[PDB]
Amino acid sequence: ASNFTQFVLVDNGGTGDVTVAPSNFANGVAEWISSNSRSQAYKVTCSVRQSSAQNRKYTIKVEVPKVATQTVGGVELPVAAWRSYLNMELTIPIFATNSDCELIVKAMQGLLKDGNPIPSAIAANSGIY
Amino acid sequence: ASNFTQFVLVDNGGTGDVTVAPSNFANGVAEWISSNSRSQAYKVTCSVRQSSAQNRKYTIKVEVPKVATQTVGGVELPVAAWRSYLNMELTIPIFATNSDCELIVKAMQGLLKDGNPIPSAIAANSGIY
Amino acid sequence: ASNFTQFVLVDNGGTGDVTVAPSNFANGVAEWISSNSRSQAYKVTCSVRQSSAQNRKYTIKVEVPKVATQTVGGVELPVAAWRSYLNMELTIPIFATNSDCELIVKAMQGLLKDGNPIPSAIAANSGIY
Amino acid sequence: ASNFTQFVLVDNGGTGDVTVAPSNFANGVAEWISSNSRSQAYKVTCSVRQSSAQNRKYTIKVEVPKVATQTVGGVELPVAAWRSYLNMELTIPIFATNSDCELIVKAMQGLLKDGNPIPSAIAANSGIY
Amino acid sequence: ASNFTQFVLVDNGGTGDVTVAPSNFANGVAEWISSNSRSQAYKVTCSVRQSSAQNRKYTIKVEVPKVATQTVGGVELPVAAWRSYLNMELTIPIFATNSDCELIVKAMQGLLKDGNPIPSAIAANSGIY
Amino acid sequence: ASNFTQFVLVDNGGTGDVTVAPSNFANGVAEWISSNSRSQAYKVTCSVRQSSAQNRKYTIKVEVPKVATQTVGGVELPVAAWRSYLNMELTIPIFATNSDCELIVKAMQGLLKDGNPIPSAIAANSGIY
RNA sequence: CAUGAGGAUUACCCAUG
RNA sequence: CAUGAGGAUUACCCAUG
RNA sequence: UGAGGAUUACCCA
RNA sequence: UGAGGAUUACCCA
């Protein structure tokens, strides 16, 4: 095995799909980027640490860019108008079994499923009400 | 267009599904919890605010109970041994359109899609390798 | 759903019934008032807080007014001769299940049921003996 | 006209009813408890005093045991995990007549009547939303 | 029950209507935002407070943006060329009954009805004459 | 041509309508007063000024009185028990066309339309919830 | 290390304990 | 935050730890 | 308080 | 400027 593989970050039905690939593991931080100039790339990082005597903490970060072409010094450069940042930390007690962890994963998937409250608000630029 | 409704957090296909329902709205912070004691419940909270002049920021928190060897309705100490905490912060620049936000949501869905690195690692009590 | 609804605070068989309605939720304090000038209204407030790592505390307050018409500066104003205050705090351990909570509610209902000791003393301006 | 008699605190319609009986009268503070160990009993106390020149004040306290997974007659620690505390303070101006007081009692009954906001929220481990 | 809902701010028949939706209710300040880029959105805020012993005071604010596209360095962002700022404070004595408040509301609606002096002056970039 | 005319401030069908009429236009401040005792009259004032290089600013004020009769020493005078004070400022950039201004006006009318959040809260002596 | 509906130029910074 | 059969002009104040 | 100014829940006399 | 207070075209920081 080896779970450090490439995957589809943004799925648009096999056309214009943002796919991300392993690009670095320096300092225990797994990194993935899209085939772009480092300045316009989507970026995903992940790291696990034994945060406490009885806890493990996953730190996941995703960077979604808004690509643009900027003219600096009369020259065009590939760049990012702005970036959206997702920072998530997951703390799991060492007593959690694999089935307990599967439960956490499913919860996170259900949380963001199309049609549910939260993803609906985010996509509509509104709050929950 | 009220989106503060109950939804399925953990989907086990009809049987054993965990539904989470509206339970509090104090301070604009929406809360959903499962039908359990608060020590063993699945909890979800969400709020949005203008983090700065250039950004808006969604703060999403999830609490998942350790289920293996759990005693329903019992007193389980220490608390830190029986619960997992998910803390998500999503920063979005004010220039993001609904379309941009829809993409950001897809990115989050892709990150956690079944079979991808991150969720597979979490579910197996592993890191990246 | 949504439990923030109006209800009958004082029941006098559908005639002269004091009914109270949602009027404010600012700062996480749910408020209800009767259709009156803010100076002569019945008022009910409720708020929940995670008072401790292992406790939740409900703070409920009710204000019963004695309406009157006062002549100030040679002018008649709707006002309250005096007000009666009820302040109750309920501390529930996070380990209490829904059935445990139902038990608490029933206890509070039984405590105040017509004919029982306490409501009998209060209504007769006496103590318990 | 002695009103210090036993009464039904939790009514389950004949079967499983919790009766609470006189157990102490030290210092004019009336006490009622269920037929249990004092660590698992239902307790009720009540006293009245002239809080100030303009008011009288009833202090009512109730203790409700956590029943789910309870071991009858056993030693359950920590105490704070197995008990709920209700603390009620009722302030009544000396001008209140018996009629005024009867109304104040109805207000308290209405507040807790079955199906109303407050009790429904408490019973569901919820807040207002 | 709830009045912290979505509503039509600008009515243009049934199409091109500007709808503002709840977004935040932090610190007793309710906020509504229209959809899409926060940068080009309409904003409405409202709050009430006891300004003094006898008065309650509503503070309402509205922001009407002039939608435009900013281009700099060849990078274009959705922005607001400028904004129009509405700012109103309404003081109401606590002796006001619901009847009195309805009158106050009709006064405000009348002040701005089509054809009347003030809305006509504003709409025509004019003053009084 | 003139917009400094009489108009209906409060519309109650066709009878009991409150009409306000021009009374003064000193120092760029237009004033309207309802008929009868000045002491019990409704008042409306309006003025515009170049607040800065880019902005013009409207300042509008309305006074709703609570009609009452004052009696002192057996002498009765027509007075206002109290007054409700509306106070609004509207800032509009000089780049706003007549089209833009009409939009701003519709926004104000929409903000106060019957049934919408704000006018409903005010009319009910309530806040947002 | 812990906690923040703390911030960001985003594997880094602040406050608090 | 904790405790008071502490007070009130009642979502706020006092004493104590 | 202000027919006080705004980058708009901030700031000046 | 101020979800700053009013006896409301005044006044405070």
PDB file of C-alpha atoms in Angstrom, chain F residues 21-128:
ATOM      1  CA  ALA F  21     -48.383  70.854   6.480  1.00  0.00           C
ATOM      2  CA  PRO F  22     -45.504  73.229   5.675  1.00  0.00           C
ATOM      3  CA  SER F  23     -44.688  75.618   8.491  1.00  0.00           C
ATOM      4  CA  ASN F  24     -41.180  76.871   8.097  1.00  0.00           C
ATOM      5  CA  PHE F  25     -38.142  76.715   5.853  1.00  0.00           C
ATOM      6  CA  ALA F  26     -35.546  78.670   7.803  1.00  0.00           C
ATOM      7  CA  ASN F  27     -31.821  78.000   7.255  1.00  0.00           C
ATOM      8  CA  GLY F  28     -32.245  75.248   4.693  1.00  0.00           C
ATOM      9  CA  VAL F  29     -34.397  73.228   7.088  1.00  0.00           C
ATOM     10  CA  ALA F  30     -37.887  72.416   5.855  1.00  0.00           C
ATOM     11  CA  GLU F  31     -40.466  71.828   8.564  1.00  0.00           C
ATOM     12  CA  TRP F  32     -43.964  70.343   8.518  1.00  0.00           C
ATOM     13  CA  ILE F  33     -46.449  70.397  11.422  1.00  0.00           C
ATOM     14  CA  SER F  34     -49.847  68.763  11.849  1.00  0.00           C
ATOM     15  CA  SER F  35     -52.788  71.021  12.729  1.00  0.00           C
ATOM     16  CA  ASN F  36     -54.138  72.082  16.148  1.00  0.00           C
ATOM     17  CA  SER F  37     -52.148  72.636  19.334  1.00  0.00           C
ATOM     18  CA  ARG F  38     -48.490  72.871  18.402  1.00  0.00           C
ATOM     19  CA  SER F  39     -47.944  71.046  21.694  1.00  0.00           C
ATOM     20  CA  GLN F  40     -49.743  67.929  20.436  1.00  0.00           C
ATOM     21  CA  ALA F  41     -48.603  68.147  16.830  1.00  0.00           C
ATOM     22  CA  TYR F  42     -46.620  65.764  14.680  1.00  0.00           C
ATOM     23  CA  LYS F  43     -43.406  67.235  13.339  1.00  0.00           C
ATOM     24  CA  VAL F  44     -41.200  66.439  10.355  1.00  0.00           C
ATOM     25  CA  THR F  45     -38.032  68.213   9.286  1.00  0.00           C
ATOM     26  CA  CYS F  46     -35.697  67.693   6.367  1.00  0.00           C
ATOM     27  CA  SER F  47     -32.483  69.175   5.010  1.00  0.00           C
ATOM     28  CA  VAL F  48     -29.696  68.371   2.558  1.00  0.00           C
ATOM     29  CA  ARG F  49     -26.095  69.486   2.538  1.00  0.00           C
ATOM     30  CA  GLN F  50     -22.781  68.684   0.886  1.00  0.00           C
ATOM     31  CA  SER F  51     -21.309  66.618   3.751  1.00  0.00           C
ATOM     32  CA  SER F  52     -17.982  66.321   1.960  1.00  0.00           C
ATOM     33  CA  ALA F  53     -16.467  66.662  -1.484  1.00  0.00           C
ATOM     34  CA  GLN F  54     -18.126  63.453  -2.656  1.00  0.00           C
ATOM     35  CA  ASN F  55     -21.202  63.178  -0.494  1.00  0.00           C
ATOM     36  CA  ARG F  56     -24.504  64.888  -0.036  1.00  0.00           C
ATOM     37  CA  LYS F  57     -26.335  64.080   3.175  1.00  0.00           C
ATOM     38  CA  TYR F  58     -30.046  64.137   3.964  1.00  0.00           C
ATOM     39  CA  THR F  59     -31.081  64.609   7.592  1.00  0.00           C
ATOM     40  CA  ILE F  60     -34.703  63.701   8.293  1.00  0.00           C
ATOM     41  CA  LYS F  61     -36.560  63.812  11.601  1.00  0.00           C
ATOM     42  CA  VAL F  62     -40.031  62.827  12.695  1.00  0.00           C
ATOM     43  CA  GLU F  63     -41.841  63.251  16.002  1.00  0.00           C
ATOM     44  CA  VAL F  64     -44.852  61.148  16.945  1.00  0.00           C
ATOM     45  CA  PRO F  65     -46.683  62.481  20.006  1.00  0.00           C
ATOM     46  CA  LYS F  66     -48.855  60.680  22.512  1.00  0.00           C
ATOM     47  CA  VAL F  67     -51.803  63.049  22.845  1.00  0.00           C
ATOM     48  CA  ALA F  68     -52.897  63.684  26.428  1.00  0.00           C
ATOM     49  CA  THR F  69     -54.449  66.302  28.721  1.00  0.00           C
ATOM     50  CA  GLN F  70     -52.391  67.800  31.525  1.00  0.00           C
ATOM     51  CA  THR F  71     -54.188  68.993  34.634  1.00  0.00           C
ATOM     52  CA  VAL F  72     -52.463  71.077  37.266  1.00  0.00           C
ATOM     53  CA  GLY F  73     -54.144  73.258  39.866  1.00  0.00           C
ATOM     54  CA  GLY F  74     -57.387  72.483  38.091  1.00  0.00           C
ATOM     55  CA  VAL F  75     -56.019  74.052  34.926  1.00  0.00           C
ATOM     56  CA  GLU F  76     -55.906  71.717  31.937  1.00  0.00           C
ATOM     57  CA  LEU F  77     -53.656  72.110  28.898  1.00  0.00           C
ATOM     58  CA  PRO F  78     -53.392  70.076  25.697  1.00  0.00           C
ATOM     59  CA  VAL F  79     -49.989  68.414  25.849  1.00  0.00           C
ATOM     60  CA  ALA F  80     -48.012  65.411  24.707  1.00  0.00           C
ATOM     61  CA  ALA F  81     -47.552  62.766  27.413  1.00  0.00           C
ATOM     62  CA  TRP F  82     -44.351  61.844  25.574  1.00  0.00           C
ATOM     63  CA  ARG F  83     -42.893  61.713  22.095  1.00  0.00           C
ATOM     64  CA  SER F  84     -41.311  59.066  19.922  1.00  0.00           C
ATOM     65  CA  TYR F  85     -38.292  60.342  17.967  1.00  0.00           C
ATOM     66  CA  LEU F  86     -37.338  59.122  14.504  1.00  0.00           C
ATOM     67  CA  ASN F  87     -33.980  60.295  13.326  1.00  0.00           C
ATOM     68  CA  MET F  88     -32.365  59.384  10.013  1.00  0.00           C
ATOM     69  CA  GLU F  89     -29.335  60.348   7.955  1.00  0.00           C
ATOM     70  CA  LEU F  90     -28.885  59.308   4.359  1.00  0.00           C
ATOM     71  CA  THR F  91     -25.549  59.702   2.589  1.00  0.00           C
ATOM     72  CA  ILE F  92     -25.392  59.608  -1.194  1.00  0.00           C
ATOM     73  CA  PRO F  93     -22.244  59.990  -3.363  1.00  0.00           C
ATOM     74  CA  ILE F  94     -22.440  62.611  -6.110  1.00  0.00           C
ATOM     75  CA  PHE F  95     -21.950  59.908  -8.735  1.00  0.00           C
ATOM     76  CA  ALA F  96     -25.412  58.547  -8.074  1.00  0.00           C
ATOM     77  CA  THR F  97     -27.707  58.996 -11.035  1.00  0.00           C
ATOM     78  CA  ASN F  98     -31.473  59.372 -10.709  1.00  0.00           C
ATOM     79  CA  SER F  99     -31.708  55.649 -11.350  1.00  0.00           C
ATOM     80  CA  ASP F 100     -29.392  54.969  -8.442  1.00  0.00           C
ATOM     81  CA  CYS F 101     -31.435  57.236  -6.188  1.00  0.00           C
ATOM     82  CA  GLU F 102     -34.675  55.501  -7.051  1.00  0.00           C
ATOM     83  CA  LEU F 103     -33.067  52.246  -6.028  1.00  0.00           C
ATOM     84  CA  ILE F 104     -32.034  53.747  -2.708  1.00  0.00           C
ATOM     85  CA  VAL F 105     -35.601  54.889  -2.172  1.00  0.00           C
ATOM     86  CA  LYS F 106     -37.049  51.474  -2.963  1.00  0.00           C
ATOM     87  CA  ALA F 107     -34.611  50.002  -0.457  1.00  0.00           C
ATOM     88  CA  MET F 108     -35.972  52.301   2.225  1.00  0.00           C
ATOM     89  CA  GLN F 109     -39.580  51.518   1.366  1.00  0.00           C
ATOM     90  CA  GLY F 110     -38.803  47.810   1.352  1.00  0.00           C
ATOM     91  CA  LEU F 111     -37.052  47.978   4.704  1.00  0.00           C
ATOM     92  CA  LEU F 112     -40.316  49.191   6.224  1.00  0.00           C
ATOM     93  CA  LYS F 113     -42.929  47.292   4.217  1.00  0.00           C
ATOM     94  CA  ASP F 114     -45.637  45.548   6.237  1.00  0.00           C
ATOM     95  CA  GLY F 115     -44.670  42.040   7.239  1.00  0.00           C
ATOM     96  CA  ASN F 116     -40.947  42.506   6.942  1.00  0.00           C
ATOM     97  CA  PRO F 117     -38.719  41.903   9.996  1.00  0.00           C
ATOM     98  CA  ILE F 118     -38.008  45.421  11.180  1.00  0.00           C
ATOM     99  CA  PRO F 119     -41.411  47.051  10.965  1.00  0.00           C
ATOM    100  CA  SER F 120     -42.843  43.928  12.610  1.00  0.00           C
ATOM    101  CA  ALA F 121     -40.431  44.048  15.521  1.00  0.00           C
ATOM    102  CA  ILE F 122     -41.074  47.725  16.168  1.00  0.00           C
ATOM    103  CA  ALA F 123     -44.837  47.374  15.928  1.00  0.00           C
ATOM    104  CA  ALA F 124     -44.722  44.582  18.502  1.00  0.00           C
ATOM    105  CA  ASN F 125     -42.503  46.295  21.078  1.00  0.00           C
ATOM    106  CA  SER F 126     -39.979  43.605  20.208  1.00  0.00           C
ATOM    107  CA  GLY F 127     -36.475  43.125  18.889  1.00  0.00           C
ATOM    108  CA  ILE F 128     -35.067  40.507  16.535  1.00  0.00           C
TER     109      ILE F 128
END
